[PDB]
């Protein structure tokens, strides 16, 4: 069966037996707790096809994370605007972080990944050598101790929550090496099935391809584990539309160049081959 | 179907198609990566039955960590010895932490749960108002903002790993409130299917029972998520024997009095009703 059907089945399960609860946004959601799906990376790339996924966003955001940035202006410069609402001086003021310059998200993914446990100053500070560099950590383990059971990168630092524009949803990833293949499991505490989850599958699938490339391994599987998997009430009509669509065969992902380091990737290094999605489905928020 | 059949099926899959790997110290496991099982908490308590689980150890260990202890002696004094090897001066010297007094495990679970991000000194220090109290954090959310999607308690602090006797296996738990019920998902990065996992299921199921009690909710589901799920090769034969056993009905768990704080439970507050496991197996 087409692997996209897991996601579509999860949509149906939530619609059909999800709990109706008033959430933070006050829009209301239907939700289930605890889900898991499995996506092969060996012969294709799991970029969902029953709607067009914002691939350009997926690529730029991950490279932005990987270099340790916490500056939304830095992502915005590449034309990807998805963090700009959260980086505005207005939004930050609303969070009780009015002292921040425009763009300073606080110690979000980039900072946690490259400097876990360091004291955050601002987005312009030099954090060289400060905190625990989890990216170096996992690459070293994958290369030199591939069967280790602690190949983890974690973004959840509760001591840093009050400094963050938003608390992370992707709590950690774990990697696993067997038979020359690299696999990845993501624990995501909160998944907006409508706008978030297809994008998120793509992000960590991409990360796995990049790590596999850099470490001389082939991509294996991506395992997506969800906590609160939910559908916003405002998404019920477009998602019912999406549920009428049959998945197309997944595309392939090609890396166009030998890249020696996780930090040396650029968007021009990737080629998506035969991505043929159904049309974009607009959904509110 | 009996929910323990999930665990037994997981055992079977690993023995059938698990990957055969040696670590950098030369020991072999069969493993699979990425697993998930669900245990109902409503009508019974999921203490596994095809081999006896060390319930007395499960209870004392959890109470010990909830009060923020990183002192193995405090656990040992209760008659539960499962952390004593790790807290021995020889073990800590083997870890590169020979300065430690006997019992000082470093910033393991107790410290991460009650003082995340604080600077660890030693097991005897007073850390009041230091770091992030995740236990108070999640109790407050469950009570006052039950639909919050950030009800997290995390034990994985990479900056602290070098100070710990052993890195945590149970990286985080998340809680969920729906229709008067409290559910819990554990992310476990590494599960010894033979010796560890049944104990681990009991631990977080009990934790959910306690939090539900304190917050006036009913226990719902425990979702167990595994990363590296493995069987040590030396365990394969006794596990083949265990796999011939039919699960017996799960016991029930009763809490004997009204307890209003997660820190006020004692082992006497818990009655395990009709736990009839098959005999323990020598692994
Ligand atoms: O990468 C992301 C980021 C956000 N969200 C969604 C999930 C929630 O609907 C919302 C975040 O809200 P909280 O869970 O923090 O309340 O955004 C995702 O699905 N994926
Ligand atoms: O609560 C625990 C603690 C440990 N283990 C097992 C898993 C591994 O076999 C071993 C820990 O070794 P590492 O994964 O840290 O290498 O102990 C468990 O199953 N449960």
Residue numbers in the entry:
A (entry chain A): 51 to 335
B (entry chain B): 51 to 333
What text appears in the publication on this structure?
TS is an essential enzyme for DNA replication. KSHV encodes functional thymidylate synthase (kTS), which shares 70% sequence identity with hTS. The overall structure of kTS was found to have a similar structural conformation to hTS, except minor differences in ligand binding site and conformational variations in some amino acids.
Although co-crystallization of kTS protein with ligands was unsuccessful, binary and ternary kTS structures were obtained by soaking apo kTS crystals with dUMP and/or raltitrexed. Three Arg residues (Arg199’, Arg200’, and Arg239) of binary and ternary kTS structures had direct contacts with the phosphate group of dUMP, which were consistently observed in other TS structures. The loop region (residues 71–79) of apo and ternary kTS structures was shifted away from the phosphate group, and the subsequent Arg74 residue was tilted out; on the other hand, the Arg74 residue of binary kTS was coordinated around the phosphate group of dUMP as observed in other TS structures. In binary complex of kTS, this C-terminal region was well occupied around the ligand binding site, but it did not contribute to a closed conformation. As calculated above, the distance across active site was over 18.5 Å in other TS structures with an open conformation, including rTS, binary kTS, and vTS structures; however, a shorter distance of 17.9 Å in ecTS demonstrated a closed conformation.
